[model samples]
Target: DPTAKLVRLNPRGGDGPGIVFAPPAGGTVLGYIELARHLKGFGEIHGVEAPGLGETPVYPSFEEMVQFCSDSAAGVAGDGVYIGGHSLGGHIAFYLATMLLDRGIRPKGLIILDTPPRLGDIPQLLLDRAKNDPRVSAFLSEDYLDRFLRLQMHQLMYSRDVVLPQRKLDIPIHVFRTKNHAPEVARLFSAWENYAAGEVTFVDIPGDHATMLRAPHVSEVAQLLDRHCGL
Candidate 1:
């Protein structure tokens, strides 16, 4: 499978501070162009497109996807790379952080955007109906099935204790919540926050899960990224 190629954007160029933007499943690198461009003001921004989504070819399973991201992230980042992704991408980032750390790959920070407690129970019936019939991830139920599935995968992926390594990295974590979501849904972010052994910051922006990363909020996310990277 063809790995998703990274798009590197830098305002200062030449190794000024690096941040990698990880995007969700079914989403392409183009989705983070705005976020990367904005981050360029602070430092170099590299976008990591996970396997099975974006420009990369699909893998056999989520595990394969995470492997690809881990290897690719290791290749591009400096000694202290900052990593983050939205939804499914965020789940992949967590796996990458824990897995890579065990392999002696250290990251400066981890940012998870809107991942659910687990991914296994992501309303499979609703997802199956959509996949069986094919209509915007939701043939008729709630809105935005793509985001729903992303959270579902997050739930499933985190269910097992051994999914991530036991060693704590003390890396900083940042979690973002969209405003239009239910109070409980926003609360779900703490699941990942607890997983991080270091400091955690939560940000709230006005938009649903999908639109939250869009525009104005894109800059907001970038600004947060700037703060995290201290640029």
Candidate 2:
């Protein structure tokens, strides 16, 4: 329950650089299992699941989580390492990239999934929209929160308004956003441009926020990753 180690997504190995990914908020190792399957032999993809999924204590702060995830980066193969994650995990991934930079380990790129650079106001924004938008209203008051807690409850301990300290990465950042991302906060992704000293490329993905990581949609994500990796 307390092992701050790496989960190898591809033991057989591949012909490209490796990728180290952190799970989205709540930190379930299983969240990326299907995508890993789809990305079989795509280098050594390691997924870091935050502690406390079992009985261990959850990360006390955002930096703690980034440090925990960065600890596993030391265990991955060297040729070329790409740090990445989904949603909150993507934010942490950005932090890890900077920390790695400080340690003289420059990741080839940051693979972020459906995470915007500026979204500290997303919670209140969603709340306000729920009052008028029926789709959002049903999403918020219904299965969204219900399933969110069920998926992982430790996420409740953290506030949604956190803004991680920014650093300019000399490496490229591959932004992968779903096609159906919330229109209410769609244009904020450009904020990544200011944080990166290198090119920040945006790629479209199929499916919604949650579905992009799951089946049917996950394949597209995997394929796009393959193209970017030139695998």
Candidate 3:
């Protein structure tokens, strides 16, 4: 387990405004270290780890995860600071934004990176497709893969009921979607319009769902961040 509560990438970088990012489901802060390095010049970059990744107890449900993320943001968020996440992390960020809004503290902005709006149980067919994904086969051992898939499925099952109401958010929501998955991803992210009273900008980014945060593609994401929320 990592001792650091917050993964402070580019710790030696500037003291400008900051952005707090949450990891994708079953992902760790270590995965964001490179992205944080790319984003640090814009401000301080911090990654929030999901519960159970460390020595702390695991969050039993989606609500607990939201509360954990909200509390984490509360500790580091400041004026002009933004909050967001990748994939499942983005879903959590959505609730985190709403939670902050309820508390009378407005965040500077919100970002959703390639995460579709919560619809319902992720179809078993989709899970099967993911199970066959070469990336999964290559990156995870069979045992770890089974555990990861179970965790993702559990999170997806819980998310079916975690829908946001027809309320409008005050903070801007910038959604970064992948061009490769445009057909499905675009339709899903478009639903976010109903949830934002503030402006909602949809930008087409390069790469597929997984590679968007890596190398050349991440450069595009970082550039967009610089334009949208960076100082």
Candidate 4:
């Protein structure tokens, strides 16, 4: 699990509000490096890597993975810490916030970048994957793909009954929604409001879900993070 250690991405160190970012499914810390660089001027940005991505050990369930991320995030330094991630990473971030809250260490906020409250129906997932698998495969290694798909199936079948706490959480949730996405998908993203007891600020970030993490769009995301998280 040593490979699952938190990867620091800031040169200024974590003196500012620390933001722990998790990678999308089948992705690694490297995927968020650009976004991290954009946020470097604001605070210490850390990317939380998942097990089985490379040489790291894989967890049996998504719940255990959340436990690992929550524990690792809490171990990092910073008085005001923020947690976030893209896609599947964002889903995990929400659970991480609740776990930290249980330890009496509520995160400053939850930054969900283009992630819905829950993964939709499995049929939709299979269809979407079939359509986009080719493009996604290009970004991942063959060995990693094999492991990631196995882990992904577990995620797909996970019950939404336990994804979020039964009670509404008090942590602020800042959702940076992408401008481009299917109408149905966008509606699902709005479901995040149901889970927030605190403020839920939705910002319209330019670019699609994937492109938002790159280039000029990432700068916009960084600016919003600085403004919202006070990073």
Candidate 5:
């Protein structure tokens, strides 16, 4: 509660590039352990928990979410740190990058996993299916799914406009997307590439929205991180 805990696989290791990863919406940091373990021995892998969501106290606003997470990261790594995450986490990382840029806190770089898409851009049919599909909750209990939906209603606070203004940084953006699910998922991911122009490096894995983070794709992503972050 007092500190933004950075889980280090090799604490006694040498100082190299620091990579801090964020989590997806309703996702816990434990889900990203593969990224942390893969990046071990490079510099340090800091998996930051959003307030009230993971290990940190939750905040209400998106801006506050970005600020706290970014600050929590700075408190641990000082400056020149790398930031990355998946889905909601990626959006937050973009916000953090912009916040730091506005504050004159230059970062080493940023890696946006799979995000930057607008909810409005999603096809109505797809959204309807996601919202009404009972099969979607196969991974979660009914009570948990209900709670999750109710909590996600909070997204109404700032989702105004189509695509929100994301953080623009001079750093490299490694965008990872999926080949699974319907074509909409891939299309949604392509939006990130278009929005970012040519500044992003894309890596497509063979899985859907729910399973992309699984072993095969995860291992592929880990290899990319190793090549870039020297994990």
Candidate 6:
């Protein structure tokens, strides 16, 4: 379970506003290092790592993964925090907000990176295959049955495994949406409004979903993080 913990991504040290983030499914804290660097002075930036990415065991259920991230995020976010994530982790971030609110520690905002409110039926076929495999590595199709691929399959499946909370939060949700995704995938982000009772804002960010946190695009992302995160 130690694999599922808070990882400090900031290069040095400073306290601005705590940003507790979960990486995309099948990813680790390493993917966000550059994003964290550009976000220097943005308080204690942390990434919540999910188990089963490497040698760690795969999470059997979605709630368990959320619970792990909730614990890890709450530990570093101090009294005030911003919770968010990329791709599948964005869904985890949503539940993380609710779980934290249940604990009486509402986050300042929710930052979503190019993730839809729900992936819906986009991944059912893979889910059916991954359902039978107990391993993180893909043994289903001959996609080489690698653990990384299997982890991604399970991670995406976790999206449907989750059910949105009946409650809504008053905090703002800043969605950094990528401009390159197809219209169908891009259109679903508006549904995030269902979870926000306060403000739901979208800012167009460069790069595809995979590249948004890399190189030049990540700088743009940092500037937005600097401007949007409530102090």
Give RMSD (Å) of candidate 5 vs. truth.
7.8
lDDT per residue, candidate 6, 1-231, as tens digits? 444757677755676778888766664555566787788547777787666544555744667777878887877653567897877777778888888888877788888888777656222443464575333113233332355466667766654645443467667889988887777877777888888889999988888887887789898888877776734
lDDT of 4 by residue, 50-120 (tens): 66666754644667777877777888723577888887788778887888888878788888888777654
Q: Worst lDDT window (10 residues) for model 1?
A: 134-143
Residue-by-residue lDDT tens digits, candidate 5, 41-151: 357776665444323334356666676777777655436477877766777676677666677676666776655456444323333434653333222344444433443
What digit string (tens of lDDT, one per residue) describes model 1 on residues 1-231? 467556564444544466676656543344555566666334566666544343323433566656777777777664657777776677667777766777787777876666554532223555565455432231233433444356345434443333332344467777766666566565566665557688877866556666656677777766766665545
Q: Provide the global lDDT of candidate 1 against the true structure.
A: 0.59
What's model 3's TM-score?
A: 0.78
Question: In model 4, what are the clashing residue pairs, if there are any?
Answer: none
Candidate with top lDDT is: 6
Summing lDDT over every window of 10 consecutive residues in candidate 5, give the lowest-scoring window.
133-142
* TM-score for each of the candidates: 0.69, 0.79, 0.78, 0.78, 0.69, 0.79
How well does model 6 score by local distance difference test? Answer: 0.71
Candidate 2 Cα misplacement greater than 4 A, ranges: 1-3, 121-152
Clash pairs (backbone) in predicted model 2: none
In model 2, state the lDDT of residue 158.
55
lDDT of 2 at 186: 76
- As a whole number from 0 to 100, the lDDT of residue 99 in candidate 5 is 69
Worst 10-residue lDDT window for candidate 6 reads 135-144
TM-score of candidate 6 against the unseen true structure: 0.79
Candidate with better lDDT, 1 vs 5: 1
The local distance difference test score of each candidate is 0.59, 0.70, 0.67, 0.70, 0.57, 0.71
Candidate 5: C-alpha lDDT:
0.57
Could you tally the backbone clashes for each prediction?
9, 0, 0, 0, 7, 3
